[PDB]
């Protein structure tokens, strides 16, 4: 793709944005699933990953650069 | 911003793309710095993080979703 720019931009914004608050950017990696889908403010409120449903056993704070 | 879409798209592509191979997408988080800047193919060739310069002491495989 090969797809409209604003459509490509929307897809990247979406994958970089928190899946629970739809506001702040992702910054927490779940262990063991490895999803990067929530921000640091939202992570403590979760027992399980929003995407798959693995019970979060650890977390790593990450920075996109 | 408030900036041209193709410019916004370029910035997001760049932050999602490996900083060493400029090809595959980022998928490794460095420990302790927490940078997500390289792919899984490129990570083993590094002793230090490309962005800051922390000596990588561990890694977590992450998936953007
Ligand atoms: Na998990
Ligand atoms: Na590091
Ligand atoms: Zn959030
Ligand atoms: Zn998950
Ligand atoms: Zn790479
Ligand atoms: Zn670093």
Swiss-Prot record, chains A, B:
Tissue-level expression: Highly expressed in fetal lung, and kidney. In the adult, expression is mainly seen in lymphoid tissues, including spleen, thymus and peripheral blood lymphocytes.
UniProt subcellular location: Cytoplasm; Nucleus
High-level lineage: Eukaryota, Metazoa, Chordata, Craniata, Vertebrata
Zinc fingers (RING-type) by residue: 18-53
PTM: Auto-ubiquitinated and degraded by the proteasome in apoptotic cells.
Gene expressing this chain: BIRC3
Family: Belongs to the IAP family.
Subunit structure and binding partners: Interacts with PRSS25; interaction inhibits apoptotic suppressor activity. The BIR motifs region interacts with TNF receptor associated factors 1 and 2 (TRAF1 and TRAF2) to form a heteromeric complex, which is then recruited to the tumor necrosis factor receptor 2 (TNFR2). Interaction with TRAF2 is required for ubiquitination of IKBKE, degradation of NFKBIA and activation of NF-kappa-B. Interacts with RIP1, RIP2, RIP3, RIP4 and USP19.
Protein purpose: Multi-functional protein which regulates not only caspases and apoptosis, but also modulates inflammatory signaling and immunity, mitogenic kinase signaling and cell proliferation, as well as cell invasion and metastasis. Acts as an E3 ubiquitin-protein ligase regulating NF-kappa-B signaling and regulates both canonical and non-canonical NF-kappa-B signaling by acting in opposite directions: acts as a positive regulator of the canonical pathway and suppresses constitutive activation of non-canonical NF-kappa-B signaling.
Disease: A chromosomal aberration involving BIRC3 is recurrent in low-grade mucosa-associated lymphoid tissue (MALT lymphoma). Translocation t(11;18)(q21;q21) with MALT1. This translocation is found in approximately 50% of cytogenetically abnormal low-grade MALT lymphoma.
Protein name, UniProt field: Baculoviral IAP repeat-containing protein 3
């Amino acid at each position: 793709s090969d797809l409209p720019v604003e459509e490509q931009l929307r897809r990247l914004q979406e994958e970089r944005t928190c899946k629970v608050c739809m506001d702040k950017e992702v910054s927490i990696v779940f262990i063991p699933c490895g999803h990067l889908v929530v921000c640091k403010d939202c992570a403590p409120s979760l027992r399980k990953c929003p995407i798959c449903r693995s019970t979060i056993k650890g977390t790593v704070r990450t920075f996109l650069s």
